[PDB]
Amino acid sequence: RPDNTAFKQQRLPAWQPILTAGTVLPIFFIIGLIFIPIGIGIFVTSNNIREIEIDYTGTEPSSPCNKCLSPDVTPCFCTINFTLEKSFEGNVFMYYGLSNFYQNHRRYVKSRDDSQLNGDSSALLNPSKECEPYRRNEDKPIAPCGAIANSMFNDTLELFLIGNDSYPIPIALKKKGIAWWTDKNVKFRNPPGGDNLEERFKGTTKPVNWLKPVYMLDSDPDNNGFINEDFIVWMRTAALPTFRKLYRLIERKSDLHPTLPAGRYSLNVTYNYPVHYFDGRKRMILSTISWMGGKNPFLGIAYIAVGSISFLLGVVLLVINHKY
Amino acid sequence: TRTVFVGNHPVQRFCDNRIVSSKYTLWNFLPKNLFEQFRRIANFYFLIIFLVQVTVDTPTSPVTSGLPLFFVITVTAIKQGYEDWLRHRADNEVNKSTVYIIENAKRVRKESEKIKVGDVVEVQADETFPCDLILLSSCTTDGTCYVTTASLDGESNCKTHYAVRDTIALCTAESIDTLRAAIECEQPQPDLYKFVGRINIYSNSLEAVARSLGPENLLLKGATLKNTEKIYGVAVYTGMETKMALNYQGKSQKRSAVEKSINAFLIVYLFILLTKAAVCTTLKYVWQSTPYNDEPWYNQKTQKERETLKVLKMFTDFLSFMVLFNFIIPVSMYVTVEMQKFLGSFFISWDKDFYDEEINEGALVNTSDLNEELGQVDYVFTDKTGTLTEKLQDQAAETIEALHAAGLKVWVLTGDKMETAKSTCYACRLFQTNTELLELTTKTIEESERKEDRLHELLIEYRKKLEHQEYGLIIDGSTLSLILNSSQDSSSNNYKSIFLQICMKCTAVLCCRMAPLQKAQIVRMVKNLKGSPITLSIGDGANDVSMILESHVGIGIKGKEGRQAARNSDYSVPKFKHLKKLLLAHGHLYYVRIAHLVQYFFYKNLCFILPQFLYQFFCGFSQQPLYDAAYLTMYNICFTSLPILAYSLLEQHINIDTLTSDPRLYMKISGNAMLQLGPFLYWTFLAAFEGTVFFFGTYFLFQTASLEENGKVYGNWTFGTIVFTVLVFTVTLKLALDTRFWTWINHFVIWGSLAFYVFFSFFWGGIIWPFLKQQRMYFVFAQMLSSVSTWLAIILLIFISLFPEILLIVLKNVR
Numbered sequence A: 001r002p003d004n005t006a007f008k009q010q011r012l013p014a015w016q017p018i019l020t021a022g023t024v025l026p027i028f029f030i031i032g033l034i035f036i037p038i039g040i041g042i043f044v045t046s047n048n049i050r051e052i053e054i055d056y057t058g059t060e061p062s063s064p065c066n067k068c069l070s071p072d073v074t075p076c077f078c079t080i081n082f083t084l085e086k087s088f089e090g091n092v093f094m095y096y097g098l099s100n101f102y103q104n105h106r107r108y109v110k111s112r113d114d115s116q117l118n119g120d121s122s123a124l125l126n127p128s129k130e131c132e133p134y135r136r137n138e139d140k141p142i143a144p145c146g147a148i149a150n151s152m153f154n155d156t157l158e159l160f161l162i163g164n165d166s167y168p169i170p171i172a173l174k175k176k177g178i179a180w181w182t183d184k185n186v187k188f189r190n191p192p193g194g195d196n197l198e199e200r201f202k203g204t205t206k207p208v209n210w211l212k213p214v215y216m217l218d219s220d221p222d223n224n225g226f227i228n229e230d231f232i233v234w235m236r237t238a239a240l241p242t243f244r245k246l247y248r249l250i251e252r253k254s255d256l257h258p259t260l261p262a263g264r265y266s267l268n269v270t271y272n273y274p275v276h277y278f279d280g281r282k283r284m285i286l287s288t289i290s291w292m293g294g295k296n297p298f299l300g301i302a303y304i305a306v307g308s309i310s311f312l313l314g315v316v317l318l319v320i321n322h323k324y
Numbered sequence B: 001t002r003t004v005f006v007g008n009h010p011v012q013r014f015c016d017n018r019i020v021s022s023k024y025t026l027w028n029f030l031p032k033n034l035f036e037q038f039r040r041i042a043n044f045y046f047l048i049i050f051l052v053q054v055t056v057d058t059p060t061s062p063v064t065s066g067l068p069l070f071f072v073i074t075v076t077a078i079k080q081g082y083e084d085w086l087r088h089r090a091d092n093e094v095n096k097s098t099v100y101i102i103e104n105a106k107r108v109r110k111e112s113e114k115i116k117v118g119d120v121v122e123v124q125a126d127e128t129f130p131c132d133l134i135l136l137s138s139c140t141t142d143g144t145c146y147v148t149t150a151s152l153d154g155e156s157n158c159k160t161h162y163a164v165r166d167t168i169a170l171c172t173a174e175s176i177d178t179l180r181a182a183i184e185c186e187q188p189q190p191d192l193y194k195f196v197g198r199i200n201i202y203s204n205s206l207e208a209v210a211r212s213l214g215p216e217n218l219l220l221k222g223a224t225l226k227n228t229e230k231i232y233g234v235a236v237y238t239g240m241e242t243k244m245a246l247n248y249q250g251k252s253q254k255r256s257a258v259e260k261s262i263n264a265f266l267i268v269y270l271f272i273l274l275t276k277a278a279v280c281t282t283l284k285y286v287w288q289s290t291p292y293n294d295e296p297w298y299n300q301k302t303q304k305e306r307e308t309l310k311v312l313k314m315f316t317d318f319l320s321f322m323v324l325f326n327f328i329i330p331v332s333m334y335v336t337v338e339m340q341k342f343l344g345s346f347f348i349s350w351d352k353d354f355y356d357e358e359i360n361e362g363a364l365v366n367t368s369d370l371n372e373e374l375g376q377v378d379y380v381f382t383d384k385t386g387t388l389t390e391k392l393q394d395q396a397a398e399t400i401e402a403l404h405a406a407g408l409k410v411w412v413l414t415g416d417k418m419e420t421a422k423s424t425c426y427a428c429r430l431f432q433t434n435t436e437l438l439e440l441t442t443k444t445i446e447e448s449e450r451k452e453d454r455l456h457e458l459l460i461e462y463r464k465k466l467e468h469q470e471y472g473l474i475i476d477g478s479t480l481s482l483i484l485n486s487s488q489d490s491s492s493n494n495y496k497s498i499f500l501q502i503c504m505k506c507t508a509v510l511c512c513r514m515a516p517l518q519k520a521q522i523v524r525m526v527k528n529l530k531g532s533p534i535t536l537s538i539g540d541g542a543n544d545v546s547m548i549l550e551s552h553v554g555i556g557i558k559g560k561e562g563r564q565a566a567r568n569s570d571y572s573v574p575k576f577k578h579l580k581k582l583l584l585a586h587g588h589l590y591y592v593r594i595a596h597l598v599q600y601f602f603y604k605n606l607c608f609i610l611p612q613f614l615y616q617f618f619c620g621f622s623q624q625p626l627y628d629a630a631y632l633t634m635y636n637i638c639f640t641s642l643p644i645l646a647y648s649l650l651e652q653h654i655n656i657d658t659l660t661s662d663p664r665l666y667m668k669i670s671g672n673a674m675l676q677l678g679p680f681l682y683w684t685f686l687a688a689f690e691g692t693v694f695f696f697g698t699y700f701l702f703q704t705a706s707l708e709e710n711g712k713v714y715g716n717w718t719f720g721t722i723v724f725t726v727l728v729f730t731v732t733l734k735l736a737l738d739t740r741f742w743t744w745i746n747h748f749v750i751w752g753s754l755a756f757y758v759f760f761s762f763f764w765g766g767i768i769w770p771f772l773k774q775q776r777m778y779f780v781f782a783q784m785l786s787s788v789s790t791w792l793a794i795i796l797l798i799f800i801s802l803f804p805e806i807l808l809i810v811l812k813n814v815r
């Protein structure tokens, strides 16, 4: 009378695996056999990557930015020398690094209106409640409202190679390409109405701290407003109190010589960013990128630790079962 | 002690046969049920968070949080309402029965609830007595009435009863003609047959009556008039005041051991949640004590924030951490447990083995709340005359042997007399030939002096043994009454405690002449013995309803006696040999499924929240969620709930046929093994260890410049997704190792839930739709997936987090 379906009688076909000790013994060895070669493979690549760090914050009387550390109404400048014993051959990337800059703060992160930054004409006039107290200045709304856009990092870091003579040679820098492809072309869009970026922003005003309007970022019309590479990169959150963002990109030189030859280098710092108030620090990073990315020894070490342990425990488990 | 008048004319605080057994009133069911339900700490916590969440801060949509809480309350409301609705129908069935009485020497028809004390009731042949009555007049010779006391003691044989000697000759000729009888009676007492009364029947002429009413004169309520013509009864006791009623004790609902462990675990994580929230708030203001940590130049507080009291800000800040980590206690677990018991109960009904071809009826599940209760049974109480015998059942002897081999102490509590009861216990293999008996019966009990005499000498000789299969205890109705009731005289050595010491180390206990309330008392006293051992009561009579309802789980056999026991009992089976298949096979599987179900949900959400807690240290302690708002909501809805849901429905830890083959396997999970402090503490530390690896594994990964060949930095939403991707893959794959019975649905649900996460993240992340005010998760998942370094880290974190689990499984094979 009861329905004799295997499901109703709990007789459904089953794989029902039975993994004994001997079934899993080769698994410990094979995992160790895979991790150690791939672990040493990524670790040796990390050491081959050449990366240098130069701090230009100051905080020391010997530091030449001490005068920039003092408050100057006029723009300040630094000239920091550094020398490289190792040359850079591959693609060279420039990062600016901020430490103790709590970009992860909940109040700070939510302080942005992506609908306004998407080029929606409606949301441009009236930003939402998220960007406060930077919603409007003197009863005029800010087009890139919010603390994230307001506090955009504005420092000019230029590099001068010096040769045998005292004459320095500037290294070419690429502004484009640093931002995500999707964020530039899709996420961040200019308002549709009009052609000249002047006409688009009538009611809106520049951010309080900004000395330049949102429509006067770069001379080129494809970086002038809401689409500037530096502006988009700064918009992305840090994910850590200490972070670094892609400032510039130095492509490999067309000549056969390495991209950045090992030599004496001099750095411009325009220092328009008062980072010392909250115990912040500013660093500039020069790195060479491989398939995995930047210099990260943790990934190489971590495979070695698990790989050696798995193989060692594989031997230990092999011995104890060998006794039986 | 009151006076009862036959004529009611001598020369509803007290229920006048209006009986109701419903726990809740139909008019005020909702306020009573909700007030009791919210009293529970588990349900109160869900409500208070919802009210706080909407009031102060919403990490996710409040609609998602409160709806299952509204769901789980409604399902319980239906279950409590349905159980209450059955009670009213059963009360209506008894109340709406036609009964004939004599009023002013006129026969009239009315219901049971109208009958009152002292009324004269004409009871015809083959109709149950509306209430316990004095037998006054019978047309039969000598007033000899035979009744089958089927409901009173579970036995169906004729019992002789005699009418009052003055009125035995009274035939059906206006016997009660303005009768002046003034019966003086004792208080209603639950001694069943035992009764004392002082009848005073006086006619118009002066008369003196010194007759003393006895058990034979009084006919108890619930008996069936068998082979006796019409009789006339006077309701000396009416309504609730009977020996058939007031032995029910009402219904105290059923509580299961697993539900006790859920509440015990829920209060632990409620204290951890308080600790987690408190430490964050305390550390937050210590961190913000520095002038520049709070409101630096980049982000500044609004004017509304500045103009707030520090104490008020602290209170909302503490609740902000509370609502952030409220995922520690999983609401989805209560919803899943509700569904697991609903769908899981149908497997018993569909089972073909629980079908008796002789009577062509199958087992059913009246109460689905105690599916897991069957796996913890260690004390069994049977009926005997109905359940154990019929003589013996087809496999009655083999079933008893199976329970004994499974570590279940089985008892044969019966209302049957001593002489015939001892015969069966030897036959059913319960009492072996060599077993001598400690017959604490009326033959071996004389007054109060021998009471302690028998107990103390057993304490001397019987206790000293602990062979085991040599001592068996027998108790009678009178002896058990004295042991329990009259034990309060000795404080130093209570007779209840010494009796429990006796029963705890016997092979079996056989009781005789047990009234239905005594069955509840003996079962209840076993319940309060060095904790709460799980008791199973099985019976198939109207008298067994007391012990069936008293125990944790009740099994009601549907036999020749009737279906009175079946409808109140949680479960019903047609044969006693089906009790083996029930608790051994289904009971073990039902517990193991839900025990691992409970432990998984708490483990799942701890791994969910622990990285969120650690992220507060690296954040500004500003209650910044590590994951997206959408990801937090759907973690418990569609990502990880389905894998563990299908697991609970159909998973055989051991092969179902193998379970019945070896009854020793039931002893493994006897003492709530899966939910003990041992396994629970391992589950928490495993969750805590996996939580740390998820966060700090990613934290050290994010110490580099970039993780892509293009050298593009990654945001905090990439940090959240990397942790979340490892989280979903680890937790789901953790269930895969635990699962040892892979079916097509189990394969589909497990691997399908993993594939759905990848698909949905691509769907949610990659298409911009103009109805979100925030577009944080635009292309993060694809960018995260498009890096070789991220792939290597994810595979590493999955294996590291599963390393303690895989080590334990391999280690469990050896020693």
Ligand SMILES: CCCCCCCC/C=C\CCCCCCCC(=O)O[C@H](COC(=O)CCCCCCC/C=C/CCCCCCCC)COP(=O)(O)OC[C@H](N)C(=O)O
Pocket (backbone or CB within 6 Å): B060, B061, B063, B064, B065, B066, B067, B068, B071, B075, B078, B079, B326, B327, B329, B330, B331, B332, B333, B335, B336, B338, B339, B342, B632, B633, B636, B637, B638, B639, B641, B642, B645, B752, B753, B756
């Ligand atoms: C690709 C393969 C398939 C992949 C999955 C696809 C999606 C599957 C859908 C659901 C998953 C499974 C189901 C998962 C269920 C649990 C999910 C859950 O509880 O998630 C919850 C939300 O659920 C819903 O809102 C859905 C409706 C729930 C009620 C109706 C649904 C249940 C009703 C069923 C019918 C009635 C059954 C009982 C009848 C009794 C009669 C007496 C959320 O849990 P949370 O723990 O996250 O709670 C919020 C949290 N506290 C916060 O801080 O915000």
Ligand SMILES: *[C@@H]1O[C@H](CO)[C@@H](O[C@@H]2O[C@H](CO)[C@@H](O[C@H]3O[C@H](CO)[C@@H](O)[C@H](O)[C@@H]3O)[C@H](O)[C@H]2NC(C)=O)[C@H](O)[C@H]1NC(C)=O
Pocket (backbone or CB within 6 Å): A151, A152, A154, A208, A209, A210, A211, A272, A273, A274, B297
């Ligand atoms: C580069 O970014 C700088 C912010 O990091 C910002 O410098 C700001 O320049 C304005 C000039 O008026 C000033 O802003 C604040 O100063 C007045 C007077 O102290 C305050 O009352 C107001 O809060 C006002 O906003 C500051 O001099 C400076 N901001 C601060 C507080 O540091 C400029 O946008 C850039 N500087 C360059 C390129 O010159």
Ligand SMILES: *[C@@H]1O[C@H](CO)[C@@H](O)[C@H](O)[C@H]1NC(C)=O
Pocket (backbone or CB within 6 Å): A077, A078, A079, A160, A168, A267, A268, A269, A270
């Ligand atoms: C940058 O460095 C150059 C080196 O020639 C020098 O003009 C000065 O130190 C800096 N100039 C400016 C305006 O930054």
